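Technical annex, item 7. During the second reporting period the consortium partners agreed on a shared format for inverse folding records so that results from different sites could be compared directly. Each record opens with the tokenized structure and is followed by the designed sequence. A conforming record, contributed by the partner at site C, is shown below for reference.
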């Protein structure tokens, strides 16, 4: 198998929020079979970012999810060729973010080509006012539709003044080659920013995920 116990990550995100462009690059590593990963992200263009960094984190690869033997693993099956995903993130106050990631593999390193575009975030909302604290752990629901895999998840950002800010994720996963399709299942997620500098020019991000049925 081309999927090894320890692998690397390299990525570049180009995007915009409310019409303002930025670019971020990252380098990381993870354990595909353990469903754990971490990475260091650096803002290359558009800094200091004028919006809450948290809207970007779930965009910075389900290959990093611990899949039990009794569940078909769409993602690990997609390599060496790889897969891509598309996602729309609908926030409760109307902010909408669309993102995509084309994932390839070079040796023991996954390569991500990411696009991120958010619009209509209210000027005095939690995202433009940087009042988000972190994402709560979640459970993604995955199901097949028209030969590809869909993943939906109810997400929530804890807020500075207390309370939560909701967002609904709708993701479409597409293997580059034909692979076996899985039956309905779930993936528990927990993403966390472990460290960052004042203006988030530098961020260390971690995530651990496990599938179940």
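Designed sequence (site C submission):
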């Amino acid at each position: 198998s081309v999927i090894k116990p320890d692998m690397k990550i390299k990525l570049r995100m180009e995007g915009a929020v409310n019409g303002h462009p930025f670019a971020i690059e990252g380098v990381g590593l993870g354990k595909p079979f353990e469903g754990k990963q971490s990475m260091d992200l650096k803002v290359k263009e558009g800094g200091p970012l004028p919006f809450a960094y948290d809207i970007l984190t779930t965009v910075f690869n389900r290959v990093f999810a611990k899949y039990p033997e009794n569940i078909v693993d769409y993602f690990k099956q997609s390599f060496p060729e790889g897969y891509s995903w598309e996602r729309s993130m609908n926030y409760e106050d109307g902010g909408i973010c669309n993102a995509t990631n084309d994932i390839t593999l070079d040796g023991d390193c996954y390569i991500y080509e990411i696009r991120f575009d958010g619009v209509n975030f209210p000027a005095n909302g939690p995202v433009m006012q940087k009042r988000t604290v972190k994402w709560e752990p979640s459970t993604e629901k995955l199901y097949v539709r028209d030969g590809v895999l869909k993943g939906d998840v109810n997400m929530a950002l804890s807020l500075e003044g207390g309370g939560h800010y909701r967002c609904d994720f709708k993701t479409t996963y597409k293997a580059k080659k034909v692979v076996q399709l899985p039956d309905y299942h779930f993936v528990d997620h927990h993403i966390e920013i472990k460290s960052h500098d004042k203006d988030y020019s530098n961020v260390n991000l971690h995530e651990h995920a496990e599938a179940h049925s």
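The two ends are 24 Å apart (CA to CA). The longest strand covers residues 20-31. All partners now use this format for quarterly exchanges.
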